[PDB]
Ligand binder design. Structure first.
Ligand SMILES: *[C@@H]1O[C@H](CO)[C@@H](O[C@@H]2O[C@H](CO)[C@@H](O[C@@H]3O[C@H](CO[C@H]4O[C@H](CO)[C@@H](O)[C@H](O)[C@@H]4O)[C@@H](O)[C@H](O[C@H]4O[C@H](CO)[C@@H](O)[C@H](O)[C@@H]4O)[C@@H]3O)[C@H](O)[C@H]2NC(C)=O)[C@H](O)[C@H]1NC(C)=O
Ligand SMILES: *[C@@H]1O[C@H](CO)[C@@H](O[C@@H]2O[C@H](CO)[C@@H](O[C@@H]3O[C@H](CO[C@H]4O[C@H](CO)[C@@H](O)[C@H](O)[C@@H]4O)[C@@H](O)[C@H](O)[C@@H]3O)[C@H](O)[C@H]2NC(C)=O)[C@H](O)[C@H]1NC(C)=O
Ligand SMILES: *[C@@H]1O[C@H](CO)[C@@H](O[C@@H]2O[C@H](CO)[C@@H](O)[C@H](O)[C@H]2NC(C)=O)[C@H](O)[C@H]1NC(C)=O
Ligand SMILES: *[C@@H]1O[C@H](CO)[C@@H](O[C@@H]2O[C@H](CO)[C@@H](O)[C@H](O)[C@H]2NC(C)=O)[C@H](O)[C@H]1NC(C)=O
Ligand code: NAG
Length: 454
């Protein structure tokens, strides 16, 4: 045996909620033909993203709760664009059955089986904030240390987020996960809003209490920090048990962070599930076809490794890329649209390799490799399908011996699915398994998903 891979289904780790992307800042409109995409390719892109059989079967869609009072440039417009005059005044809410294209997108994703919709606000509306502006950070009026002459807007913001979730549910598209901050560290020209851990915790408790009063069942998140270390720094604040004997962590279902300022390479110190909720290559490079060339930020293998590391080393339950599909020739999205043209990147195919076979409620299980040139991850689905991801970073093909150890069902067949410079997500011939062990060659510089049958 040249390379030994051992999988142990009796050594079990975190659950998986899934994989996906956002179509925020009007990028959902691109999929529906804003820049000339044909009806054929609109349907094709939705199948690539959300069909388990025809595509990646993404299971999480992250939508923006818009803060803007218009839909100019790439703004996401708000359900409450204009101040009601005071926090206690009756709000005027507008529902356009659109949400910058994210509503019809959510309908199309759900039609193809998508279970999880994560609605996240980048900012409260400007009139609820210290700077009276959705932009350039600022704080929710009434949060600890941040008073405003117009009064305390904390309950108004909670009621606003509840009303967004209600419009979605009433329109047949329930939201499963809810967040109220994005990158609270960042002071930027676009929708942004500040909070440290204790300021975030204060609002988590108000929002959780509001949802419980309304009888709405939804998973709360915090805080989409700009990097993994930056999110870790907020967790002590979320864990402070207040006078009432509750922490923010008691109300939270998921702790969320981004990969930009620091990558998900270590476990966060929360007792909750964690999600990597945004990450991409923002360099402005264009790397659609490269799985491996020289370790560029946009290469397929870079992203296969980011995903594998997030699950094995950072203990995440989900991985959400930034934009799925957009009219651009950069690496910001997984799928480049060029008017009526669809170019799925190797970053897309790396995501697809995981997402297609690691279905919601899968559990990560122990998987080891005898050699640092081959890195491995493994998950058992609730239907018993085992999906093993192998990255071969050798310059030659690697002959693997893969032992599945002790299992309930004797495994009889396994199917390899390959992603490389030569292959997108290519199904290879089934391999016969004997005594829960099999041999497989994997190409140089490749990702292979080995998927067990029945
Ligand atoms: C599989 O094994 C291979 C080796 O065989 C490893 O490859 C090396 O991968 C690293 C990254 O992990 C590579 O280093 C990075 O290269 C990037 C691309 O560089 C080229 O293109 C850019 C942009 O045009 C040029 O600027 C540059 O001169 C090169 O022409 C760089 O963009 C990266 O830079 C960034 O990160 C560094 C380090 O943190 C920062 O200092 C920089 O400022 C910047 O943010 C980086 O240098 C390296 O080139 C690869 N070597 C080879 C021989 O290919 C893989 O890592 C390995 N994969 C796995 C998953 O283990
Ligand atoms: C829907 O999206 C499709 C996918 O993008 C569109 O089809 C593509 O249209 C472009 C023109 O905009 C064609 O581009 C040319 O490609 C050739 C090279 O061709 C070949 O190699 C590819 C890659 O493996 C292969 O799939 C092709 O079949 C060819 O063998 C260049 O010489 C040209 O300069 C230009 O780049 C694409 O080839 C074409 N792709 C496919 C798969 O058809 C399509 O037009 C969109 N609309 C509709 C209504 O279908
Ligand atoms: C609509 O939103 C815009 C953008 O946030 C608001 O404009 C800002 O208002 C604040 C407060 O006066 C200023 O500090 C910013 O400079 C403004 N930004 C821009 C780009 O103009 C605007 O007030 C909002 N309109 C209403 C009616 O609420
Ligand atoms: C990996 O993440 C999981 C959550 O997905 C962590 O699981 C929690 O474990 C604590 C301590 O044993 C329990 O009190 C919680 O009930 C678990 N949460 C869930 C949702 O199951 C696990 O601790 C994390 N691992 C590491 C090494 O940090
Ligand atoms: C969409 O993307 C292509 C490629 O970047 C670009 O050339 C084109 O102008 C964009 N389409 C528009 C604005 O119609």
């Amino acid at each position: 045996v040249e390379f030994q891979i051992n999988v142990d289904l009796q050594a079990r780790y975190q659950s998986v909620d899934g994989f996906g992307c956002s179509q925020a800042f009007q990028r959902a409109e691109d999929i529906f033909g804003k820049y000339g995409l044909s009806p054929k390719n609109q349907s094709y892109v939705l199948d690539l993203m959300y069909s388990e059989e025809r595509g990646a079967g993404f299971t999480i869609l992250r939508n923006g709760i818009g803060s803007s009072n218009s839909s100019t440039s790439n703004l996401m417009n708000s359900i409450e664009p204009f101040s009601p005059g005071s926090p206690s005044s009756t709000p005027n809410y507008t529902w356009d059955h659109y949400n910058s294209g994210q509503f019809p997108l959510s309908q199309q994703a759900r039609a193809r089986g998508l279970p999880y919709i994560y609605a996240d606000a980048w900012s409260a509306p400007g009139y609820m904030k210290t700077n009276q502006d959705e932009n350039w950070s600022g704080f929710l009026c009434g949060i600890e240390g941040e008073t405003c002459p117009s009064g305390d807007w904390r309950q108004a913001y909670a009621d606003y987020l509840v009303q967004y979730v209600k419009f979605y549910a009433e329109s047949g598209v329930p939201v499963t996960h809810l967040g109220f901050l994005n990158e609270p560290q960042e002071v930027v020209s676009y929708a942004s809003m500040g909070s440290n851990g204790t300021q975030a915790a204060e609002f988590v408790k108000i929002l959780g209490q509001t949802l419980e009063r309304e009888g709405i069942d939804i998973e709360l998140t915090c805080c989409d920090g700009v990097g993994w270390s930056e999110q870790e720094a907020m967790i002590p604040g979320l864990q402070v048990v207040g006078p009432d004997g509750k922490s923010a962590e008691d109300y939270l279902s998921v702790v969320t962070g981004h990969g930009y300022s620091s990558a998900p390479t270590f476990p966060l110190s929360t007792k909750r599930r964690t999600w990597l909720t945004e990450w991409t290559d923002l360099s402005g490079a264009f790397t659609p076809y490269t799985f491996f060339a020289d370790g560029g930020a946009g290469e397929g293998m870079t992203w296969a490794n980011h995903i594998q590391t997030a699950f094995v080393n950072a203990n995440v339950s989900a991985f959400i890329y930034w934009i799925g599909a957009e009219n651009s020739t950069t690496n910001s999205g997984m799928i480049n649209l060029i008017n009526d043209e669809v170019i799925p990147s190797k970053r897309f195919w790396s995501m697809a390799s995981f997402s297609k076979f690691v279905r919601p409620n899968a559990q990560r299980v122990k998987a080891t490799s005898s050699d640092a040139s081959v890195t491995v991850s493994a998950f058992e689905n609730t239907n018993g399908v085992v999906a093993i991801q192998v990255i071969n970073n050798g310059t030659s093909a690697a002959s693997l011996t893969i032992d599945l150890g002790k299992t309930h069902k004797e495994v009889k067949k396994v199917v390899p699915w390959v992603t490389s410079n030569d292959y997108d997500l290519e199904e290879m011939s089934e391999i016969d398994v004997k005594h829960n062990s099999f041999l497989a060659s994997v190409p140089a510089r490749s990702l292979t998903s080995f998927v067990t049958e029945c």
